[PDB]
Symmetry: none
Subunit: 69 residues, 6 copies
């Protein structure tokens, strides 16, 4: 096995003999910009470029949670 | 196995003998811009380009959750 | 196996002997811009281009959930 | 197996002996802009282009869910 | 197997011996702009073009769901 | 197998011995603009074009669902 890229992700849940149970496993997935390149020969020639990435994130999420048993 | 790219994602749930159970596993998936390139020979010649990516995200989500047993 | 790209995604659910059970596994999938390129020979010649990507996302979703058992 | 692109997606549900069960697995799928290119020889020559992508998303979805057992 | 593109999607449901069961698996599919190109030789020559994509999405969907068992 | 594009989609449901069951699997399919091109030789020559795609989507769909068992 020569050059290669392997990404392993996800959820692996196993239940063998549930007599009385309640498994609650929501799976939220959000994948933003993803760039995957593969080439035998790659030759890139550039000039006075400009690459700009702007991240304005006003994340607003106050928390007042509570867990009881 | 030479050059190659493998992405592994998802959900893997197994139930073998549920007598009384309630599996709740919602699977939400959201994949934004995804660029996958493959080439034998890649030759790119550029000039004074401009690449701009603008992310204004006013995420508003207050939380008042509560879990009881 | 030479150059190649493999993407593995999805949901894999197995139930073997459900006597009394309730599997609730909604699968929501949303795939935005996806660009997949394949070429033997790729030669790109550019000039003073302009690439702009604008993401205004006023995500509004307050949460007041509660889970009971 | 030389150059090739494989995308694997979907839902895989198996039920072998349901005596009393209720599988609820809705499958919502939404695929936006998808561009797939294949070429033996690709030669692209450009000039001062302008590529613009504008994403105004006022996602409004407050949540007041509750799960009981 | 040389250059080739394979997309695998859909739903795969199997029921072998349902004695008393209720499988509810709606399959909603919505595929927007999809561009698939194939060429032996591709030569594109451009000038000061303008490509514009405008996404105004006022998604309005408050949620007040509830799941009981 | 040289260059070729394969798209696999749909629903695959199997029932082998239903004694008392109710499979509810609606299949809603909506395919918007789809462009598929094939050519031996493709030569495109352009000028200061303008390509515009406008997506005004006031999706209005509040949800008050509830699932019981």
């Amino acid at each position: 096995r020569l050059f290669d890229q392997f990404f392993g992700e996800g959820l692996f849940e196993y239940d063998l003999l549930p007599f009385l149970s309640s498994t609650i496993s929501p799976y939220y997935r959000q994948s933003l910009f993803r760039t995957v390149l593969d080439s035998g020969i790659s030759e890139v020639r550039s000039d006075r470029d400009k690459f700009v990435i702007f991240l304005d994130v006003k994340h607003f999420s106050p928390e007042d949670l509570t867990v009881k048993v």
